[PDB]
Symmetry: C3
Subunit: 272 residues, 3 copies
Amino acid sequence: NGYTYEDYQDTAKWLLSHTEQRPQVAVICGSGLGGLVNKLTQAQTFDYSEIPNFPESGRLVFGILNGRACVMMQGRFHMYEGYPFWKVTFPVRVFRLLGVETLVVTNAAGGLNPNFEVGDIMLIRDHINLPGFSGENPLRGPNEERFGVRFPAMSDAYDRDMRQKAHSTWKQMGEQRELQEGTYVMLGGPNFETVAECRLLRNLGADAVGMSTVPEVIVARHCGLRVFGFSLITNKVIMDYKANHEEVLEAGKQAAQKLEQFVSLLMASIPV
Amino acid sequence: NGYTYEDYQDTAKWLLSHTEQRPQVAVICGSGLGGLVNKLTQAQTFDYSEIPNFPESGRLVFGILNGRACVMMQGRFHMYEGYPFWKVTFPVRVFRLLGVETLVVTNAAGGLNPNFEVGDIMLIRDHINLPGFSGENPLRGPNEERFGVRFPAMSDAYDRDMRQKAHSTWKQMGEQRELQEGTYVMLGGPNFETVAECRLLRNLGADAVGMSTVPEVIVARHCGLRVFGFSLITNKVIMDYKANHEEVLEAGKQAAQKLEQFVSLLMASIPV
Amino acid sequence: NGYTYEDYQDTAKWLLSHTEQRPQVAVICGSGLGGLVNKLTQAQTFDYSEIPNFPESGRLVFGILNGRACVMMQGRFHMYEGYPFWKVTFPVRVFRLLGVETLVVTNAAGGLNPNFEVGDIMLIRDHINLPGFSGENPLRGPNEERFGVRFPAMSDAYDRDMRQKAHSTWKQMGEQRELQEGTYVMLGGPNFETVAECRLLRNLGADAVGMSTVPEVIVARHCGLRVFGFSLITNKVIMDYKANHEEVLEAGKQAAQKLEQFVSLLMASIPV
Ligand SMILES: Nc1nc2c(ncn2[C@@H]2O[C@H](CO)[C@H]3O[C@H](P(=O)(O)O)O[C@H]32)c(=O)[nH]1
Ligand SMILES: Nc1nc2c(ncn2[C@@H]2O[C@H](CO)[C@H]3O[C@H](P(=O)(O)O)O[C@H]32)c(=O)[nH]1
Ligand SMILES: Nc1nc2c(ncn2[C@@H]2O[C@H](CO)[C@H]3O[C@H](P(=O)(O)O)O[C@H]32)c(=O)[nH]1
Ligand SMILES: [Mg+2]
Ligand SMILES: [Mg+2]
Ligand SMILES: [Mg+2]
Ligand SMILES: [Zn+2]
Ligand SMILES: [Zn+2]
Ligand SMILES: [Zn+2]
């Protein structure tokens, strides 16, 4: 944490005086998932570059989505860019200081579970934090009690109530493909995995693999936010003897109409 | 290593001129295990803050325990506090420069082995250093030959002679519960593990999980110290679909009379 | 990357003006494998200390090997020495700027596969990057497009064509022992592994374990180099309840006549 408690306060104060919007829910939009901001009403956008203390990516968009006041991150930060986790997760603590109570995290991931198929939406039921095993953690350093406790529990990170609400909502949508669920594993990147690494990750119990999200979830739970999230399976990883960026980028627009409807409906029952 | 060889020497010299005690054994007391210092005779305490070069935690207590001259660390340092391993392990090299020959390391840990039960004492037979897999190691950097070799072996870290002496001593005590043995795995922390992570760690062959000890053992072996250690199982980790700090704190006082007797008896046969 | 693009250019320019040699192949010689430079004709050596920007180890030797113009690293750099991966891999990008098209990487490793025997040569078919799981990666930071893409694929890192050429060449040599193949796993070091760690690594699917190579391969693939490599199995790791440096050093001279012949023949078919 290269930021003082006051830095977070200064940023939150700036945002509160520049918009009349007062979000109750924050949504972090992953790779190729930034199209959700388009459905917001009474929207107000701020490029990250205009906000004091924000890291370099992207923009923050406030607005109303299906009755709920939200704030969305159009673009996120990654460890592979050279940013320490205290920079990657800066926005999460700011959201808490704005009065946000729930965080929705989304991402694009590679499918490790053999039953998954391209286009599947996997509700995140749990995660595996590989960088955390070695000490790379956003909570490393002196603990700030004004945010949370020294040793936070992480076994109940993904809200059970919201996950059931998610399944009920997916049923009302009348989708032919079942809503998937699984464990998300995060690794640093930026290179893609070798076959041997993919086999290993699957045997660790992982269903999907990506390069983000886990740090943000840990910080959100530390400061008391309710957490819900999902992965868009953009490709099936090969487990025997290639993957590119445009593949995940194309897959993004592929299931755009699907994700937008889903997230919009979930706002109805969060709750408040 | 942000410390010069001279820094270690300066600290050892300070200690040698401020107490007449000349310890042969050093004991690092973990979470809720600091009550052992109470049985020391001719004791002398120094807060870490009074000792030149010591990291910030805690106190060092010299004294006689059941016939043996000892020095105990009442409180230790952790990677999750933001300290590099060269700071976490500073005391170990100082002990070597004082003439200490044996290091006893203790800690509180979560039980991964299904047969373990709360209150069990697990002798550490081996360990798994996860942070070490990624390069986070107290020996990283130029090697100081005055302490040890460039590529130290770690497969024989936990002295076999002492482990058998430990079992014989535990038998003379007449305990109803058998003395457990197992592999300790260290992860960075400070958050507690998710269910998926717990399942993974068990399949890696780990019997107990914690956030310390391994760095100190590696440094002790590098500089030639005999090593012995154990974990107090404060709780059984859940492997299916919470843990707090006061749970391990309460469990500490729970088996206080047990640990104190055990450690005191082990001093009898170390040997000298 | 603490180096600017210009730094790489300055170093490459220095080398190009100090030798008439123009290598097409670069070979990194591992522990006890530096004897290959002896067969070079029209050789020219530069201690790393004479080359602007080079890290501290060792020497670079240019020359002709069995008809092919080569440049060899007599000694490499390791993460355990305290060097970040951007320093460890500096030479690889310089080689690309010299016009090198293929990189041959060699190392000494511990055998995890039960069928391996001391003296065996294991062709590297794939790898597992443990430090990479936690973010320690030579590509971490802003991406330099003049070298490669932001998200490079790594599943096809070890050239299939060269691996088959390797097997054909090994057959013409008339060796009694078959040429082995397997997955190489890299860990930080400098201490050697415990029994519990060895068992774990084997279950991850690793056949050989060492403290180098992976970073260099990742950087080579990022900048477009064809990659081929192998490990000299210097010892069989114990999987039940010691290893030193002179053991791998002695094993090096043991299979010197073997490795030298093999590498020399492979130059014939790389191709050009
Ligand atoms: N590590 C990894 N990432 C993958 C794979 N398939 C898709 N991804 C996505 O590729 C992207 C890079 O092309 C990664 O970042 C994004 P996000 O976490 O910002 O939403 O998700 C990741 C994959 O197979 N492995
Ligand atoms: N990582 C981890 N640590 C645990 C668990 N159960 C008990 N612990 C203990 O919780 C403590 C934090 O509440 C950790 O530090 C101490 P020590 O290593 O300083 O003796 O041991 C650790 C557990 O389930 N996981
Ligand atoms: N990590 C590890 N390294 C081993 C083992 N057996 C041999 N090695 C070699 O010991 C050497 C240290 O004695 C390591 O560095 C060299 P190189 O990567 O520079 O070629 O290879 C490594 C082994 O069992 N484990
Ligand atoms: Mg700014
Ligand atoms: Mg001080
Ligand atoms: Mg120089
Ligand atoms: Zn203004
Ligand atoms: Zn004094
Ligand atoms: Zn000159």
